[PDB]
Design an enzyme around this catalytic site. Structure first.
Site, PDB file in Angstrom:
ATOM      1  N   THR A  28       0.956  -0.882   0.204  1.00  0.00           N
ATOM      2  CA  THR A  28      -0.606  -0.134  -0.007  1.00  0.00           C
ATOM      3  C   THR A  28       1.153   1.322  -0.225  1.00  0.00           C
ATOM      4  O   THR A  28       0.402   2.240  -0.128  1.00  0.00           O
ATOM      5  CB  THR A  28      -1.646   0.427   1.161  1.00  0.00           C
ATOM      6  OG1 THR A  28      -0.085  -0.552   2.180  1.00  0.00           O
ATOM      7  CG2 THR A  28      -2.431  -0.482   1.538  1.00  0.00           C
ATOM      8  N   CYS A  88      -4.015   0.325  11.140  1.00  0.00           N
ATOM      9  CA  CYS A  88      -2.646  -0.321  10.995  1.00  0.00           C
ATOM     10  C   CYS A  88      -1.749   0.326  11.939  1.00  0.00           C
ATOM     11  O   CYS A  88      -1.728   0.852  12.594  1.00  0.00           O
ATOM     12  CB  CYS A  88      -2.179   0.481   9.531  1.00  0.00           C
ATOM     13  SG  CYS A  88      -1.432   0.269   9.184  1.00  0.00           S
ATOM     14  N   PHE A 115      -6.486   4.277   7.739  1.00  0.00           N
ATOM     15  CA  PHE A 115      -5.399   3.376   8.430  1.00  0.00           C
ATOM     16  C   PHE A 115      -6.775   2.238   8.869  1.00  0.00           C
ATOM     17  O   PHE A 115      -6.065   1.838  10.185  1.00  0.00           O
ATOM     18  CB  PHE A 115      -4.220   3.526   8.932  1.00  0.00           C
ATOM     19  CG  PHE A 115      -3.185   4.311   8.303  1.00  0.00           C
ATOM     20  CD1 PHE A 115      -2.435   2.856   7.186  1.00  0.00           C
ATOM     21  CD2 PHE A 115      -2.842   5.457   8.265  1.00  0.00           C
ATOM     22  CE1 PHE A 115      -1.304   4.340   6.589  1.00  0.00           C
ATOM     23  CE2 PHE A 115      -2.217   6.858   6.925  1.00  0.00           C
ATOM     24  CZ  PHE A 115      -1.342   5.356   6.566  1.00  0.00           C
TER      25      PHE A 115
HETATM   26  C1  HEM Z   1      -0.042   3.559   3.214  1.00  0.00           C
HETATM   27  C2  HEM Z   1       0.146   2.746   3.418  1.00  0.00           C
HETATM   28  C3  HEM Z   1      -0.540   1.805   4.109  1.00  0.00           C
HETATM   29  C4  HEM Z   1      -1.751   1.918   4.211  1.00  0.00           C
HETATM   30  C5  HEM Z   1      -3.075   2.092   4.044  1.00  0.00           C
HETATM   31  C6  HEM Z   1      -2.431   0.615   5.265  1.00  0.00           C
HETATM   32  C7  HEM Z   1      -3.776   0.490   5.868  1.00  0.00           C
HETATM   33  C8  HEM Z   1      -4.227  -0.655   6.574  1.00  0.00           C
HETATM   34  C9  HEM Z   1      -5.981  -0.854   6.603  1.00  0.00           C
HETATM   35  C10 HEM Z   1      -7.188   0.265   5.911  1.00  0.00           C
HETATM   36  C11 HEM Z   1      -5.916  -1.780   7.570  1.00  0.00           C
HETATM   37  C12 HEM Z   1      -6.916  -2.257   8.736  1.00  0.00           C
HETATM   38  C13 HEM Z   1      -7.181  -3.784   7.931  1.00  0.00           C
HETATM   39  C14 HEM Z   1      -8.469  -4.651   8.231  1.00  0.00           C
HETATM   40  O1  HEM Z   1      -9.730  -3.537   9.224  1.00  0.00           O
HETATM   41  O2  HEM Z   1      -9.598  -4.974   7.439  1.00  0.00           O
HETATM   42  C15 HEM Z   1      -3.899  -2.435   7.939  1.00  0.00           C
HETATM   43  C16 HEM Z   1      -3.919  -3.347   8.931  1.00  0.00           C
HETATM   44  C17 HEM Z   1      -2.668  -3.309   8.885  1.00  0.00           C
HETATM   45  N1  HEM Z   1      -1.910  -3.253   8.170  1.00  0.00           N
HETATM   46 FE1  HEM Z   1      -1.506  -1.320   7.034  1.00  0.00          FE
HETATM   47  N2  HEM Z   1      -1.647   0.884   5.792  1.00  0.00           N
HETATM   48  C18 HEM Z   1      -0.189   1.049   5.268  1.00  0.00           C
HETATM   49  C19 HEM Z   1       1.071   0.675   5.522  1.00  0.00           C
HETATM   50  C20 HEM Z   1       1.701  -0.611   6.065  1.00  0.00           C
HETATM   51  C21 HEM Z   1       2.830  -0.772   6.804  1.00  0.00           C
HETATM   52  C22 HEM Z   1       3.919  -0.059   6.264  1.00  0.00           C
HETATM   53  C23 HEM Z   1       2.568  -1.771   7.738  1.00  0.00           C
HETATM   54  C24 HEM Z   1       3.839  -2.848   8.059  1.00  0.00           C
HETATM   55  C25 HEM Z   1       4.989  -2.541   8.362  1.00  0.00           C
HETATM   56  C26 HEM Z   1       1.611  -2.361   7.409  1.00  0.00           C
HETATM   57  C27 HEM Z   1       0.836  -3.293   8.303  1.00  0.00           C
HETATM   58  C28 HEM Z   1      -0.598  -3.718   9.101  1.00  0.00           C
HETATM   59  C29 HEM Z   1      -0.761  -5.003   9.677  1.00  0.00           C
HETATM   60  C30 HEM Z   1       0.121  -5.700  10.127  1.00  0.00           C
HETATM   61  C31 HEM Z   1      -2.180  -4.655  10.263  1.00  0.00           C
HETATM   62  C32 HEM Z   1      -3.019  -5.506  10.487  1.00  0.00           C
HETATM   63  C33 HEM Z   1      -2.988  -5.088  11.945  1.00  0.00           C
HETATM   64  C34 HEM Z   1      -3.924  -5.507  13.427  1.00  0.00           C
HETATM   65  O3  HEM Z   1      -4.899  -6.209  13.402  1.00  0.00           O
HETATM   66  O4  HEM Z   1      -3.158  -5.898  14.974  1.00  0.00           O
HETATM   67  N3  HEM Z   1       0.671  -1.588   6.719  1.00  0.00           N
HETATM   68  N4  HEM Z   1      -3.469  -1.034   7.282  1.00  0.00           N
HETATM   69  C1  LIG Z   2      -4.917  -5.464   4.837  1.00  0.00           C
HETATM   70  C2  LIG Z   2      -4.542  -5.239   3.752  1.00  0.00           C
HETATM   71  C3  LIG Z   2      -5.865  -3.805   3.947  1.00  0.00           C
HETATM   72  C4  LIG Z   2      -5.195  -5.328   2.699  1.00  0.00           C
HETATM   73  O1  LIG Z   2      -6.373  -5.497   2.151  1.00  0.00           O
HETATM   74  C5  LIG Z   2      -3.948  -6.818   2.277  1.00  0.00           C
HETATM   75  C6  LIG Z   2      -3.105  -7.419   3.588  1.00  0.00           C
HETATM   76  C7  LIG Z   2      -2.487  -8.605   2.949  1.00  0.00           C
HETATM   77  C8  LIG Z   2      -2.662  -8.315   1.305  1.00  0.00           C
HETATM   78  N1  LIG Z   2      -3.045  -7.324   0.117  1.00  0.00           N
HETATM   79  C9  LIG Z   2      -4.114  -6.800   1.067  1.00  0.00           C
HETATM   80  C10 LIG Z   2      -3.264  -3.911   4.078  1.00  0.00           C
HETATM   81  C11 LIG Z   2      -2.348  -4.296   2.611  1.00  0.00           C
HETATM   82  C12 LIG Z   2      -1.195  -3.246   3.489  1.00  0.00           C
HETATM   83  C13 LIG Z   2      -0.766  -2.588   3.910  1.00  0.00           C
HETATM   84  N2  LIG Z   2      -1.625  -2.664   5.249  1.00  0.00           N
HETATM   85  C14 LIG Z   2      -3.551  -3.688   4.624  1.00  0.00           C
END
Ligand code: HEM
Ligand SMILES: CC(C)(C(=O)c1cccnc1)c1cccnc1
Ligand code: NI
Ligand code: NI
Ligand code: NI
Ligand code: NI
Length: 460
Positions: free
Chosen positions: A268, A400, A393
């Site tokens: 993302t 996130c 996020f």
């Molecule tokens: C522009 C960058 C990013 C966006 C827009 C984004 C977006 C999101 C969103 C919308 C969720 C919610 C998922 C859900 O509710 O089903 C999420 C969760 C999560 N993201 Fe991100 N993410 C970004 C970057 C990252 C990065 C850099 C990492 C790790 C280094 C990451 C790891 C995770 C993890 C592990 C979760 C779930 C954590 C939990 O539920 O305990 N994401 N993200």
């Molecule tokens: C959970 C979420 C939104 C997602 O749709 C996702 C997760 C794993 C692989 N591809 C997409 C995502 C994707 C990238 C970073 N953080 C969260």
């Protein structure tokens, strides 16, 4: 006051399924929202969900006491790749809070300061890659952003160098990942998934997972015959213990988190940087206003942690890009108990909701009618924004975990990009958004003329 909920065309037994028969389903949904409004019912062979689009309904959906995170059909399929990792595990599932407690220190404030020097290591490589292009050559924007973002999470998170800038094809990990994620997205439209017509697909899928697990094997092995080691995301992932239970993650769940963070930690963020650079060349006055701040703040050969935190207009550029096109376009929620939504829509227990984030960010009762216009100035004051109006996020404890990681990296890199180059819309690129469960503008190329500003030596 109970309301009857609108629902688009139903094709008999398939219900609303054939409507999402597109390369671009999220966008097909946004257009449906434009006709049907705040909320509409969407069902298909399997289950029913309800797409929300207004801030009015979503701020209620974001109440963690009434609603909990649901695994959408997509996530349930991604679960075949990521298992019960942080992303694809239920809130009340065993390994979630266990890993949530173990890994959250790796995204603490002094964890970020630790990542910075390595974040710059990769950022320099991006700049130099462009400093060394020839006069004719194009810059494939999303491709190079993926190189940067993947290498960053690979180094900061696991001290493993993918060395993506030493390859002109994508890393073997990437190709298998994209195929496996495209399969999870494609299986949603699949009538009979276990029809032997897709044995061909299941055979490629088992292979892509082999390839991806082969790389996790390398990461864990390299850490074995090490002796530094020291304190990154893998270190906690291997040695940390959940306070509440005094237990560490399995030999199995560890592999799931590595795959989780290798994918989530870049997929993302690459899109965000691509969307940012896209809007910047399409809105040159914004580009120069941000280019000025970059030149003004970044006064050293390499950016410091504090300097990145001072690129405020750049951060606004990123947030506005996340507004128009959140690269994670949706997250799902389920009713913990029976309830009413907005005092109009009665939900049974376990009923599923979908937050259509790009449409939420276009709510004219929040942002005005100039919703499709790219003004970073909307975020010049954070408190001016209603709670649960800007949700790129996610929400609550399921939000996130790497939000700050992404935003710090994206700001730093975009800052260096603007300090060192001017950018030309070499093809006058017509925006073509590619959906792979995530949003990313494909076919986007630019041209960069170097400002010939030198760099320096990489920190630690
Ligand atoms: C522009 C960058 C990013 C966006 C827009 C984004 C977006 C999101 C969103 C919308 C969720 C919610 C998922 C859900 O509710 O089903 C999420 C969760 C999560 N993201 Fe991100 N993410 C970004 C970057 C990252 C990065 C850099 C990492 C790790 C280094 C990451 C790891 C995770 C993890 C592990 C979760 C779930 C954590 C939990 O539920 O305990 N994401 N993200
Ligand atoms: C959970 C979420 C939104 C997602 O749709 C996702 C997760 C794993 C692989 N591809 C997409 C995502 C994707 C990238 C970073 N953080 C969260
Ligand atoms: Ni009423
Ligand atoms: Ni050309
Ligand atoms: Ni193997
Ligand atoms: Ni530690």
């Amino acid at each position: 006051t109970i309301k009857e909920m609108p629902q688009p065309k139903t094709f008999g037994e398939l219900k609303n399924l054939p409507l999402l028969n597109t390369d671009k389903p999220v966008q097909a949904l946004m257009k449906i929202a434009d006709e049907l409004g705040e909320i509409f019912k969407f069902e298909a062979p399997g289950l029913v969900t309800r797409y929300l689009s207004s801030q009015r309904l979503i701020k209620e959906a974001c109440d963690e006491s009434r609603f909990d995170k649901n695994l959408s059909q997509a996530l349930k399929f991604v679960r075949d790749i990521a298992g019960d990792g942080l992303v694809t595990s239920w809130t009340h599932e065993k390994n979630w809070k266990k890993a949530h407690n173990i890994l959250l220190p790796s995204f603490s404030q002094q964890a970020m300061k630790g990542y910075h020097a390595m974040m710059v290591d990769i950022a320099v490589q991006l700049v130099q890659k462009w400093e060394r292009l020839n006069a004719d050559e194009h810059i494939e924007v999303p491709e190079d952003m993926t190189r940067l973002t993947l290498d960053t999470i690979g180094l900061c998170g696991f001290n493993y160098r993918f060395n993506s800038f030493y390859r002109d094809q994508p890393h073997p990990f990437i190709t298998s990942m994209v195929r496996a994620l495209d399969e999870a997205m494609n299986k949603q439209q699949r009538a009979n998934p276990d029809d032997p017509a897709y044995d061909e697909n299941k055979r490629q899928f088992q292979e892509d997972i082999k390839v991806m697990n082969d790389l996790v094997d390398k990461i864990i092995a390299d850490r074995k015959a090490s002796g530094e080691q020291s304190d990154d995301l893998l270190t906690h992932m291997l040695n940390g213990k959940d306070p509440e239970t005094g237990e560490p993650l399995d030999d199995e769940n560890i592999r799931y988190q590595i795959i989780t963070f290798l994918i989530a930690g870049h997929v993302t963020t690459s899109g965000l940087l691509s969307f940012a650079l896209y809007f910047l060349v399409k809105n040159p006055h914004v580009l120069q206003k941000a280019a000025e701040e970059a030149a003004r703040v970044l006064v050293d050969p390499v950016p410091s942690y504090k300097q990145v935190k001072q690129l405020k207009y750049v951060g606004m550029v990123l947030n506005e890009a996340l507004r128009l096109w959140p690269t994670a376009p949706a997250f799902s929620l389920y009713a913990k108990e029976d309830t009413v939504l907005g005092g109009e829509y009665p939900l049974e227990k376990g009923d599923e909701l979908m937050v259509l984030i790009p449409q939420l960010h276009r709510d004219k009762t929040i942002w005005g009618d100039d919703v499709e216009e790219f003004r970073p100035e909307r975020f010049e004051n954070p408190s001016a924004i209603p709670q649960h109006a800007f949700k790129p996020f996610g929400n609550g404890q399921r939000a996130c975990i790497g939000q700050q990681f992404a935003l710090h990296e994206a700001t730093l890199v975009l800052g260096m990009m603007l300090k060192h180059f001017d950018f030309e819309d070499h093809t006058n690129y017509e925006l073509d958004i590619k959906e792979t469960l995530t949003l990313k503008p494909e076919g986007f190329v630019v041209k960069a003329k170097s400002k010939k500003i030198p760099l320096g030596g990489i920190p630690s």
